[PDB]
Symmetry: C3
Subunit: 336 residues, 3 copies
């Protein structure tokens, strides 16, 4: 493309929405390539991540853990204005795994408190991709303090199965999974710290054990359960995007399946089918497509069940509709 | 199918056999869909898992760790009579990853001691699938106490490679891999308990380290060696089903390969080929197909070699037949 | 083939080179099957694995960690002369995951100090494959002491993508990733040992935690950085072979991708495409193919970033050439709000 051609492309501002929700978009690209414009403000803030009042000094894109899902189409440009308010204490940047060059954008986006930057990259590859902060000399600490999210680069013609049949979802959720490493005193009580930097040395010690104290969805134990369960109806087609910026995970829909799973997250690699449990390596995003067939409460988990039910990696779906006795039936209910 | 149509289908009662053996079945489906009937009694028993006399309070489907492999074909119905004897102390249930609805059957099969239940589900998706117990509030504890197995849902026309060529095995073995988390006293000696519930609190602390004390096949270190080594001959086609309900594994046949590997365990997902070491995520089953070409002793391991040779994850195959010097020869035997 | 037909085949003696470099070879096979001959001497040697001077008594094929990459084509015979010099103290052997029978060759290559052996096998399956020592009773200790490498069995017609299109690399690197388990004292400082045997019991304890103290490329923290960084140019096609004989890894090129990735390492299994981060399970090798599009520094890491940046699993590429502002541009450089 010529300089004038790039310059002439339409520019569109998109307002972001907090996870697990996803901003309005079209599955099939509406017209030619665009420069899609997003803005995110970085917030350093204390968050509580469990029922014991455990604190983390979060580093949060757009104020959330994970950061929001940005959606564009292949060969669009993504143009991010990233803002680091003067009230923050650390330099921050952004690495888009979807982008090509300068450490994914990290080398071009180092902003001190009181600074902003604008990065544009061409989204040449279709898929879901991780993004994360990566300040040289403290990369893992930034990432495991929650400074990560994902984007989706849809094929211009939307999603398809391995045989080129269209796969069109009715809704989409983004589940960001976070490993946290919270220091404890010798009595086993989680420690609290006045300033983010104060926790650095104690936290790295925990990190080096490679054993998270908490593994959570949407930034806290139980964030996506109970009255915050995700929703669907029988017959509804749902895409579940799942990311993990630092550590492996194995998602599983209890009572369901991944009908089509782009386990690697890349849409030019044909999806696996009929999956019980899929695998997303640390530093990647994946996506599963499922049509609900049964009503009721589902759990959606990391299928290391210790991580799911002891460490926090469990969400719910509440699904409306009619029960299908062909698929499953209690022939004899639990009885003496 | 309507209730009436289901009621009219032929019934077939199957008698289960202890792992690693697999009950009598046909690879190609005999006739139209049927209701395949299985019965399992839950046994809570002490198992010894290593040569140091270390004990686990097992929770065992059909009295074994893993539970037995159930084999059906796609679009058959699997009808399980699950029995929880008065000699047990805990509520138990079953989640079939192969099933659709009610948390894989777990919501509909909660049986107190002295109770039984019958669940029927349509096996709509072909592949190997995990099944496991999942009592709300105690899910990981049930699973890592050995309450898990697998089923195989064969395609009605049997197995095929990625290009439609038939793959027919002569032998089939089922390896269930188990991560155990056994508490230790202050001298590093493993603890013994006189009732299952007594170990709970201590065990949860070990589980939270995400570091198993033992990783075993068929419920114990060395279980599938010696009297229980798997057997074959040169020229024989062998299918090895492998499950792990809670934790990742990486199977490898030492001296062999996985000629065809359904690493995700799902038969509509084309198999990988010529594998050295495959990968099965926690909460899943996989299957490898191999034609033996050399006689001798083989080891079959989780290829984290610490897990294989320090923690217990190693089995043997004993293979009869003629040595093939074209494939491999000692040109100069070890010498000065 | 018969003994006689194999005897008639041409021989090719190859000189191995140290990782991350790879000995001269042809992507598309030159002529018919050959017996390709390699020699490696095993060295039990003290090595330094980080900038602090932490020592490990390594067990090293050809004196390097990892051992060197051997390259043959499908249905060639690989013929290895393996030597265990009298200066060593342990029995050693070799298991080629590429080979069929006798525990990958381990059953036939058990050599005490002062012994040698010659093993030949037919490389029947195309792909990259781990090889490693495996003395019964001491298997994981040998492997996590650095005694492992990889081989590449190219298809006779070179590489192709999943749809038959030829993929020809301009250069190839071999990154061997090593998990080390180094005992610490009550200060938390790494211990040093006079003899390899002295370290055994303390090391097995660390191994049991399943938590390495170091996770490194080419035998040490920072080994593939500075004047030892890998290099490329804009437009250059690079194959990166990556192995891990004992523990999972998740490779990622920061600023790039794996355009085609044989994540399982086996060339008859079609590659994944457009990968951000791929996965290679412990006991396997994988390979990624990438065409560089942008100049500058890249890091190549295990994307458990704690492993990458705290434990040592990070390498650098330095890439020359002209920057592409279409692909990426700083619309507004960091500046005051
Ligand atoms: Cu990254
Ligand atoms: Cu499950
Ligand atoms: Cu091996
Ligand atoms: Cu940051
Ligand atoms: Cu149970
Ligand atoms: Cu050795």
């Amino acid at each position: 493309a010529t300089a004038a051609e790039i310059a002439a492309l339409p520019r569109q501002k998109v307002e972001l929405v907090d996870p697990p929700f996803v901003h309005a978009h079209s599955q099939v690209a509406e017209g030619g390539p665009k420069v899609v414009e997003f803005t995110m403000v970085i917030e350093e803030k204390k968050i509580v991540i469990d029922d014991a009042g455990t604190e983390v000094h979060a580093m949060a894109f757009n104020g959330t853990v994970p950061g929001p899902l940005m959606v564009v189409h292949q060969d669009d440009y993504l143009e991010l204005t990233l803002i680091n308010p003067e009230t923050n204490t650390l330099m921050h940047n952004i690495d888009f795994h979807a982008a090509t060059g300068a450490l994914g954008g990290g080398g071009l986006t180092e902003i001190n408190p009181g600074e902003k930057t604008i990065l544009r990259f061409k989204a040449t590859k279709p898929g879901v991709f991780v993004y994360h902060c990566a300040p040289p000399g403290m990369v893992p600490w930034a990432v495991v303090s929650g400074m990560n999210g994902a984007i989706m680069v849809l094929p211009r013609e939307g999603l398809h199965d391995g045989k080129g049949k269209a796969l069109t979802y009715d809704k989409i959720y983004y589940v960001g999974e976070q490993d946290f490493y919270v220091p404890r005193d010798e009595n086993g009580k989680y420690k609290k710290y006045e300033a983010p930097g104060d926790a650095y040395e104690d936290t790295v010690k925990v990190m080096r054990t490679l054993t998270p104290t908490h593994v959570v969805f949407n930034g806290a134990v139980g964030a996506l359960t109970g009255d915050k369960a995700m929703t669907a109806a029988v017959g509804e087609k749902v895409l579940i995007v799942h990311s993990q910026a630092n550590r492996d995970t194995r998602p599983h829909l209890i009572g369901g399946h991944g009908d089509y799973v782009w386990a690697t997250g890349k849409f030019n690699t044909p999806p696996d089918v009929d999956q019980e449990t899929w695998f997303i390596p640390g530093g990647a995003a994946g996506a599963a497509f499922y049509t609900f067939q049964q009503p009721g409460i589902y759990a959606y988990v990391n299928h290391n069940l210790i991580e799911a039910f002891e460490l926090g990696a469990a969400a719910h779906f509440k699904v409306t509709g009619e029960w299908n006795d062909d698929l499953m039936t209690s022939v004899l209910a639990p009885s003496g």
